[PDB]
Design a protein around this ligand. Structure first.
Ligand SMILES: Nc1ncnc2c1ncn2[C@@H]1O[C@H](COP(=O)(O)OP(=O)(O)O)[C@@H](O)[C@H]1O
Ligand SMILES: Nc1ncnc2c1ncn2[C@@H]1O[C@H](COP(=O)(O)OP(=O)(O)O)[C@@H](O)[C@H]1O
Ligand SMILES: Nc1ncnc2c1ncn2[C@@H]1O[C@H](COP(=O)(O)OP(=O)(O)O)[C@@H](O)[C@H]1O
Ligand SMILES: [Mg+2]
Ligand SMILES: [Mg+2]
Ligand SMILES: [Mg+2]
Ligand SMILES: [Mg+2]
Lengths: 479, 488, 528, 201, 50, 66
């Protein structure tokens, strides 16, 4: 997609394409907000929920020409949705969090659809490792993705991506010469080291030649006093917070700090203090009298790395008191590949999040979609009246996804669904489309699975949107 | 738009606004004209409302009908100055005749009823007729309260008219205090009090600050610690001075502080913040207190007295209003207009202003005449009878005056649905045969043409101005012969 | 041949006389009531509003008050019906669709009466005696309750399930009725509807909404401060912790040495320490402030184990003083004249992708929060808008507890009282009174017309049942037949139906009296 | 009004000027007042635009704030001791001075045009004072009646009753803006005819 | 040019309100102002006489 | 330090950028030197111009040992 400003983004996510487009029909501007909801809770299946919602609204064209009121279709669709949940729940299989083989198989299924399908024998294991290091597997009800920080760095290729069990800073140090410290004592500071400034408007008046030399002398003994308090605690690495109203580090304080073999790092934002305190375990210090040798966080190594010419980077590893945070460095050759590589990893984190909230696994590859299209067919024969036509319309619209998986792979869509449906009512119920073999086989032998929350959350949200479209009868333009 | 059966006009403002009104002054005001003579008629009606307040759509009808009758005289070879000379002689006969049939009854507090019947007729024309009995008791009761009886004047600054949309039209009531649109400073203050002594203040609650370019120098640490102590003792000194004098409620013109807000709450002493200028002097007159500019001047003899200070709440909105009533003898009252429409409130305000202005006129001059067209039929006979003894080419001008004077009865009959020439002829024939100058037009279909029984009352000075002012404008128009204007 | 040979007005100003002004005011008002009619009744449809200059804000709504506030009309007589509709929404919050349809049906019946050569003042005087005879027959039919708790609760459940009917919430009517009736009883008789905070956020179905037992706050805690504390003692304050107390005077420092500046700087840092120590004398562990808290006092609270919540506006501080039960405190000089809050557990919750501070276990609980979940952004906006109509009408029933049977029974009741009066008064007003009774009977007609039923047959059955004694008969929209209203449970509020008659009769009176429309020269807009 | 309602007064008459809070709390009819014609700003302001205050201690801070409130109250007391009842001033009168004169049954006015104060002087017999340090009996005015009536929706102040008056004032009552201008121009012709007719009989 | 009307019967103000640009005619407008400055009456009697 | 109308720093920055590029190639320089100027006169202009920028203050791959 190319923006009108001159920005080009190669994407594959269904939630990203619909955001970048600029549609003007009001009925299609509601489809963008549908896929946004699936990206928030489920985090995957954003493309599937638009196909389902776009196929149900189509099946409503023939029912209107037959003389069926739209209110009956709204109530009859809820009948086929409440039944569809009961067909998906008993199909699923419970799973535990002590089984790495299941999570590895579920972190590759939502990885092989992207441009990094070739590099999954490396990104899948580092995605499972990044989630088990944040939550407690004994009592886990939700995972915060804010505890995982993704860093994008140009240069190299994708297979150079790694997992850092520490703190990564994107800015170089201010002190020149000292770039390698072992067994460091990190310390966070929030006050500035410059000439004394009060909140009230102050000024110094000189009315004698002898007082000119005192201003310079007494100034120099004030900065020196604060630097000698820091070295008393035994500090090696310094982290200064950003300040805009007054200077945070003068050239005099930096001259003293280099002479005591201390690394100085300036310009730290006010939004990532918590992530720093959660990683190395550093008490923030906002006053000089509170700078005690207990306000400090230990570490093993704190040194800056130098790339092949793309910049410098800061790595602090081996924390004495590690938290529940982890960070990932993404490497790519182009600015377009890095963005797509980053979205692919964020998809493999939302699938692991879905497994901890609802420990249930359901076979993928078009297996569930054809199952709801078969139980609802015989279900509608038992009903009578005008509601028996709406359930049949619900079942037929569920065959679009099994038709799309076979059409994109260059197979016959008519013969595939006919063979798929026939084998689904005579035996096993885990048969799907095999894109590698080229036909239909047992889908569990391909080691492809997906969480149960994705298939359900992509159906509850789809039916609700259609029930609101059928309420609309007029469009009027306002100011 | 004349008489009880008239219809009103839609008006659209230049920008986007809509006004519905029946008053003659405002209709000619928001109408944008380009003719210069049309701008003279606009000023003719405006000079009537501010002088009396009633009759502003009656003057332009008479002046317009007075000019039309002179059109035939000019075509016969008659100098315009001769017409403008004969008109003034007729206006001296009609005015001298109007005092002869004028009746004065009485004006005081104990027997009020002729005053009610005077304001009933003026309200008869406007949209406020469903409840026009109630709105005729507010107008009369809110005038003798604020009016002096020795100097014979009315201060309209002492009467506040405030309308709030939403509710019902018959919920309008007269408040004998001051209602201000504000609320208490702290959300945890009591909404009502039963015995409050009002402490009117002008000065804010901040620490003092001189107007000249002060600068305070801090050259040590003890000077700094002596400044924090100075600030906190000044707040506590203020609350002690209010509580000592016995005050119960504080009223301030300027704002409070974060610290001076709790001290008022912690001491069980509610207060109101950021009140307006004109509203303060109405609370001082109503409650009987005095205004102090400092805290040092606050004594026990400078405090007001209220009987009830509540905080009324409207419907599902955040609009709170403070009301003050149950006071002793007062000189300030307010009118609270309600209604379910934006245009109802605005027209209700205009109709009430006309009712108040009618009673104000009766204080200056007690004597009244009877309306419904009775004054015009009687005045047109005196002019016509005297014109028979004036042989100097003035009988034509006098007869033309008495013919344009009868357009008022012919405008009420046409609006009512009756035939003008068939009803007007029968009224004069009955008035000459009898000796009853109080016969008019039965516009409301009640059966009797006797206006005295139907209680139709009009102020005398209202009718005098509609003749003396309308004649003089005709003299300008008849004097003007040349126009020089640029072309567009 | 033209409009008078002379030119009075300016260039661009227009005037309309009697025969054409009545044409504009009557086609302008009918157009307003025709767009809105489609959204009336249990089976009314829904509209879409697109803005052409407001960055294309797509909003989807049903109520007849937000539609009129958005449609840009230039008709002078159509602006009256848009203003009266706003006042209805700001008075009782329900009945905007019914007040515009009724006032638009009165005007339609007043155009065929002018064509019969009837003076407008005859219609108006005849309608005044019709409204008076209609409001007397509605007051006499009201059922006053409130002496029994088991009966008053059943009356509030019926009102709530009747308002939510035309709205999108009608799918889950059994679930949103309990959330709407329990949130009003938490106010304990106070009409402060602002105390209910409706928090809406994307994700989840409409059936995942709930009413929280305690409270929820969308704020954050300081760094390295305890996330949970059991058995808390909350202190609600409003004091300036920004930098320092500026101590407003015209003051400045005029020392002559740079060591004396360092001493004054240390004096500010010991001014804030003293202020913090005066707070801790209360014996608290949860400080809540309505302004910012800077980096110095943030560490002082975190060293004694105190939770500090910063940047909570007036909307979140006034509410927290009604939930826990504390007071908004300042000046911190007397710990014995202040009252602290109370809780039982404070934790951090995860609703979707955001963190909120949860208050489990409260003393008073006079305010609450409602969490709305939905698929699209337009469903969240419509659920909030519809839910606000259920809370507004239940705050009126508690102050004035008398209900009137709805669902078409009340409209036919007042229409019969006018008919018996119109058969008594001689003259032309008998014709004008029948038009008033004719306009009230089309409100039940529109409800049955949207559902596709035989409207002309159901009104005849209702009119025949209301003139023989059956005063509770009304429409039954679930089947299509005639059913009782005291059994099914269709109930309305007395104040809502009273404000519809009085508002729709005044607006039809103001418009009908107009006989001349005078337009000034429009203000031009500068193109460049 | 009407053309026959024009009056000639035997003193001065000027329109009501801007008034602050408390103006409606003071009497509007006097029997034998003493007019104090002034040219002073009786309002709380800075002593001189070119000024600066440099205080060192908080005890001297409070004495400065009390010094400005004592300068103003010194001027008002000097007026009240002189026996005056009506005060006029070209420069504005603040609200603090308005409420000072309301508690002592004394009338106040401000922002009077120069053409109206000079017409008062040759009607009452005072003098414009730029200072309040000298208010003797010979620098005050006197009359017989003073009131504030309403004419045509406007408030006017009257100073009738001056036996030694040497000025008059015409109040013209018409019905339009051009009715009064033509009446004023017509009156301007009889004024100059009589003025020329005294020097040449 | 703005729209303000000046209605009067006296020569002096009528001749002041006309934008006379003729050099010969501007003498008659200048003597009218002289008459209304010395005596104040007879302004339109010196215009017909001239 | 008495220049009025950023802090004027932008105006002097762009002028010396074009001037340095022009003086490096010594383009159109013979028009000024031929009538009585010299090379050192222009050097003092850019040296002084750099000083005023310094008064208007706003506020390599070998880093192993020192
Ligand atoms: N009840 C009544 N019966 C007969 N004439 C009336 C009645 N009420 C008012 N009028 C007449 O209506 C005329 C016009 O008054 P109105 O329409 O109120 O406007 P305005 O008072 O501004 O002229 C008056 O001259 C009065 O005589
Ligand atoms: N379940 C129901 N059965 C019959 N009538 C109903 C029902 N619910 C609502 N109504 C009727 O629908 C009418 C319109 O209600 P609605 O459109 O929801 O809001 P408004 O009153 O603002 O138009 C009401 O007068 C009510 O009597
Ligand atoms: N009573 C009278 N009878 C006849 N002519 C008169 C009478 N009074 C004045 N005049 C004449 O009218 C003229 C007045 O002209 P006028 O319009 O006043 O001119 P101006 O305005 O320049 O003085 C005088 O020249 C005088 O001769
Ligand atoms: Mg996927
Ligand atoms: Mg009137
Ligand atoms: Mg409703
Ligand atoms: Mg003359």
């Amino acid at each position: 997609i190319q923006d009108g400003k001159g920005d080009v983004t190669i994407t594959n996510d269904g939630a990203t394409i619909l955001k970048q487009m600029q549609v003007l029909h009001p009925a299609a501007r509601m489809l963008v907000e549908l896929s946004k909801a699936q990206d928030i809770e489920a985090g995957d299946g954003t493309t599937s929920v638009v196909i389902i919602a776009g196929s149900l609204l189509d099946s409503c064209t023939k029912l209107l020409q037959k003389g069926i009121h739209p209110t009956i279709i709204s109530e009859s669709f809820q009948k086929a949705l409440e039944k569809g949940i009961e067909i998906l729940t008993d199909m699923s299989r419970p799973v535990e969090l002590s089984d790495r083989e299941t999570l590895l198989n579920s972190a590759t299924t939502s990885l092989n659809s992207k441009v990094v399908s070739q590099y999954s024998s490396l990104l899948s294991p580092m995605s499972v490792n990044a989630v088990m290091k944040v939550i407690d597997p004994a009592t886990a009800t939700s995972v915060d993705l804010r505890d995982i920080k993704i860093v994008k760095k140009l240069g190299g290729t994708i297979d150079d991506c790694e997992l850092v069990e520490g703190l990564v800073l994107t800015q170089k140090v201010s002190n020149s010469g000292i770039t390698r410290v072992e067994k460091a004592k990190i310390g966070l500071i929030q006050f500035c080291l410059s000439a004394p400034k009060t909140d009230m408007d102050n000024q110094i008046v000189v009315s004698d030649y002898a007082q000119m030399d005192r201003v310079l002398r007494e100034e120099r003994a004030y900065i020196l006093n604060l630097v000698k308090q820091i070295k008393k605690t035994g500090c090696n690495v310094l982290l200064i917070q950003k300040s805009i109203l007054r200077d945070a580090l003068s050239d005099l304080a930096l001259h003293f700090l280099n002479k005591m073999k201390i690394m100085v790092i300036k310009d730290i934002e006010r939004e990532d203090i918590e992530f720093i305190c959660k990683t190395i375990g550093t008490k923030p210090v906002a006053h000089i009298d509170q700078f005690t040798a207990d306000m400090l966080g230990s570490a093993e190594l704190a040194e800056e790395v130098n790339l092949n010419g793309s910049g410098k980077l800061l790595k602090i590893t081996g924390c004495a008191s590690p938290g529940k945070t982890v960070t990932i460095v993404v490497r790519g050759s182009n600015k377009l590949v890095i963005e797509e590589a980053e979205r692919s990893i964020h998809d493999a984190l939302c699938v692991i999040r879905c497994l901890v909230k609802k420990r249930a696994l359901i076979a993928g590859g078009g297996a569930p979609e054809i199952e709801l299209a078969l139980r609802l067919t015989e279900y509608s024969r038992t009903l009578s009246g005008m509601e028996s036509y709406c359930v049949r319309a619900f079942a037929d619209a569920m065959e679009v996804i099994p038709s799309t998986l076979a059409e994109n792979a260059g197979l016959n869509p008519i013969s595939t669904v006919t063979e798929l449906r026939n084998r689904h009512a005579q035996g096993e119920k885990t048969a799907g489309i095999n894109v590698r073999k080229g036909g239909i086989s047992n889908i569990l032998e391909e080691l492809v699975v997906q969480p149960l929350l994705v298939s359900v959350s992509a159906l509850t949200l789809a039916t609700e949107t259609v029930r609101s479209i059928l309420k609309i009868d007029d469009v009027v333009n306002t100011r | 738009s004349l008489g009880p059966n008239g219809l009103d006009k839609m008006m659209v403002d230049k920008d986007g606004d809509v006004t519905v009104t029946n008053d003659g002054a405002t209709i000619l005001s928001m109408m944008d004209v380009d003719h210069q003579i049309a701008k003279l008629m606009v000023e003719l009606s405006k000079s009537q409302d501010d002088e009396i307040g009633d009759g502003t759509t009656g003057v332009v009808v008479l002046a317009g009908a007075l000019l039309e009758e002179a059109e035939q005289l000019l075509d016969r070879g008659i100098h315009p100055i001769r017409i403008a000379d004969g008109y003034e002689q007729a206006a001296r006969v009609a005015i001298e005749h109007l005092d002869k049939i004028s009746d004065s009854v009485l004006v005081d507090i104990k027997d009020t009823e002729p005053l009610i019947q005077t304001a009933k007729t003026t309200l008869g024309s406007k949209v406020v007729n469903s409840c026009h009995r109630q709105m005729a008791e507010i107008a009369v009761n809110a005038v003798l309260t604020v009016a002096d009886m020795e100097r014979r004047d009315v201060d309209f600054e002492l009467i506040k008219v405030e309308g709030k949309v939403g509710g019902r039209l018959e919920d309008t009531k007269l408040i004998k205090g001051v209602i201000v649109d504000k609320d208490f400073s702290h959300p945890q203050m009591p909404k009502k009090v039963e015995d409050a002594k009002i402490a009117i203040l002008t000065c804010p609650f901040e620490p003092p600050k001189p107007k000249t370019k002060h600068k305070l120098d801090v050259t040590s640490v003890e000077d700094y610690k002596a400044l924090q102590k100075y600030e906190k003792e000044k707040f506590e000194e203020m609350i002690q001075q209010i509580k000592e004098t016995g005050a119960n409620l504080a009223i301030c013109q300027w704002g409070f502080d974060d610290e001076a807000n709790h001290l008022l709450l912690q001491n069980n002493l509610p207060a109101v913040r950021w009140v307006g200028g004109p509203e303060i002097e109405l609370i001082a007159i109503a409650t009987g207190g005095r205004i102090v500019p400092r805290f040092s001047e606050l004594t026990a003899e400078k405090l007001g007295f209220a009987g009830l200070v509540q905080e009324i709440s409207f419907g599902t909105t955040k609009d709170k209003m403070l009301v003050i009533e149950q006071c002793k003898n007062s000189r300030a009252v307010t009118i609270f207009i309600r209604g379910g429409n934006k245009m109802i409130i605005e027209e209700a305000k205009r109709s009430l202003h006309d009712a108040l202005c009618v009673i104000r006129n009766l204080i200056r001059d007690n004597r009244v005449v009877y309306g419904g067209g009775a004054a015009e039929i009687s005045c047109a006979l005196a002019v016509s009878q005297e014109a028979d003894k004036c042989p100097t080419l003035e009988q034509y001008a006098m007869r033309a005056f008495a013919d344009a004077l009868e357009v008022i009865p012919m405008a009420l009959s046409e609006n009512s649905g009756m035939n003008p020439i068939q009803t007007m002829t029968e009224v004069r024939a009955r008035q000459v045969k009898e000796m009853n100058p109080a016969l008019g037009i039965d516009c409301l279909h009640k059966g009797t043409n006797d206006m005295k029984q139907q209680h139709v009352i009009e102020t005398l000075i209202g009718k005098k101005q509609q003749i003396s002012l309308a004649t003089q404008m005709v003299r300008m128009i008849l004097k003007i012969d040349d126009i020089r204007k640029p072309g567009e | 041949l033209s409009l008078a040979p002379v030119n009075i007005f300016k260039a661009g100003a227009d005037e309309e006389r009697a025969e054409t002004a009545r044409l504009t005011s009557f086609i302008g008002a009918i157009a307003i009531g025709d767009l809105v009619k489609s959204t009336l009744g249990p089976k009314g449809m829904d509209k879409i509003l697109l803005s052409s200059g407001r960055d294309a804000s797509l909003m989807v709504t049903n109520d007849g008050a937000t539609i009129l506030k958005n449609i840009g009309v230039d008709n002078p007589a159509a602006k009256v019906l848009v203003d009266m509709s706003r006042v209805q929404d700001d008075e009782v919050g329900d009945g905007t669709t019914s007040v515009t349809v009724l006032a638009a049906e009165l005007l339609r019946e007043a155009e065929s009466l002018i064509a019969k050569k009837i003076h407008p003042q005859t219609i108006i005087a005849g309608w005044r005696e019709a409204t008076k005879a209609a409001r007397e027959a509605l007051l006499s039919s009201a059922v006053d309750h409130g002496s029994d708790e088991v009966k008053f609760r059943q009356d509030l459940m019926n009102i709530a399930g009747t308002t939510l009917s035309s709205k999108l919430l009608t799918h889950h009517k059994d679930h949103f009725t309990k959330l709407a009736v329990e949130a009003v009883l938490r106010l304990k008789g106070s009409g402060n509807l602002e105390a209910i905070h409706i928090i809406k956020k994307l994700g989840g179905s409409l059936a995942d909404s709930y009413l929280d037992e305690g409270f929820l706050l969308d704020k954050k805690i300081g760094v390295n401060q305890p996330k949970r504390i059991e058995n808390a003692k909350i202190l609600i304050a409003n004091t300036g912790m920004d930098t320092d107390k500026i101590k407003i005077f015209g003051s400045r420092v005029r020392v002559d040495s740079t060591a004396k500046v360092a001493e004054i700087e240390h004096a500010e840092k010991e001014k804030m320490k003293e202020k913090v120590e005066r707070i801790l004398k209360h014996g608290i562990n949860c400080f809540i402030n309505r302004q910012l808290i800077y980096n110095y006092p943030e560490q002082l609270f975190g060293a004694a184990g105190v939770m500090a919540i910063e940047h909570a506006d007036f909307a979140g501080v006034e509410r927290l003083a009604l939930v826990t039960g504390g007071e908004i405190a300042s000046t911190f000089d007397h710990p014995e004249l202040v009252k602290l809050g109370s809780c039982k557990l404070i934790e951090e919750v995860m609703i979707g992708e955001d963190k909120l501070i949860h208050f489990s276990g409260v003393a008073l609980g006079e305010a609450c929060t409602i969490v709305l979940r939905g698929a699209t952004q337009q469903i969240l906006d419509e659920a909030e808008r519809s839910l606000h109509d259920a809370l507004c009408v239940l705050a009126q029933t508690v102050k004035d507890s008398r209900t009137v049977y709805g669902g078409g029974c009340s409209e036919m009741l007042m229409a019969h009282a006018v008919t018996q009066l119109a058969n008594r008064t001689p003259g032309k007003e008998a014709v004008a009174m029948e038009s008033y009774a004719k306009a009230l009977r089309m409100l039940p007609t529109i409800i049955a017309d949207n559902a596709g039923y035989d409207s002309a047959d159901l009104v005849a059955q209702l009119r025949a049942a209301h003139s023989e004694g059956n005063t509770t008969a009304g429409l039954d929209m679930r089947e299509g037949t005639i059913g009782d209203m005291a059994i099914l449970g269709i109930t309305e509020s007395f104040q809502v139906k009273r404000q519809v008659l009085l508002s729709a009769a005044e607006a039809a009176e103001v418009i009908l009296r107009v006989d001349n429309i005078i337009k000034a020269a429009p203000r031009k807009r500068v193109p460049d | 009004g009407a053309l026959e309602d024009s009056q000639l007064v035997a003193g001065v008459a000027f329109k009501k000027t801007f008034s602050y809070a408390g103006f409606e709390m003071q009497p509007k009819k006097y029997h034998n007042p003493k007019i104090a014609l002034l040219n002073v700003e009786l309002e709380l302001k800075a002593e001189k635009d070119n000024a600066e205050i440099r205080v060192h201690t908080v005890e001297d801070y409070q004495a400065i704030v009390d010094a400005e409130w004592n300068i103003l109250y010194d001027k008002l007391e000097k007026i009240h001791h002189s026996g005056a009842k009506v005060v006029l001033s070209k420069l504005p009168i603040g609200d603090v001075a308005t409420q000072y004169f309301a508690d002592r049954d004394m009338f106040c006015a401000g922002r009077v045009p120069e053409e109206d104060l000079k017409r008062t002087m040759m009607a009452c017999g005072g003098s414009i004072q730029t200072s309040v340090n000298a208010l003797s009996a010979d620098v005050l005015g006197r009359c017989q009646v003073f009131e504030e009536t309403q004419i045509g929706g406007e408030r006017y102040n009257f100073f009738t009753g001056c036996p030694k008056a040497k000025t008059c004032t015409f109040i013209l009552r018409g019905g339009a803006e051009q009715f009064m201008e033509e009446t004023e121009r017509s009156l301007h012709d009889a004024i100059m005819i009589v003025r020329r007719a005294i020097k040449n009989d | 040019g703005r729209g303000k009307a000046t209605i009067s019967n006296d020569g002096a103000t009528i001749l002041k309100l006309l934008d006379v640009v003729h050099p010969a005619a501007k003498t008659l407008v200048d003597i009218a102002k002289s008459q209304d400055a010395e005596v104040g009456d007879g302004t339109t009697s010196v215009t017909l006489l001239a | 330090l008495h220049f009025f109308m950023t802090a004027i720093q932008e105006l002097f920055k762009r002028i010396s950028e074009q001037f340095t590029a022009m003086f490096r190639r010594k383009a159109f320089l013979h028009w000024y030197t031929g009538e009585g100027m010299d090379e050192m006169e222009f050097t003092e202009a850019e040296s002084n111009m750099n000083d005023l920028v310094s008064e208007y203050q706003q506020y390599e791959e070998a880093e192993e040992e020192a």
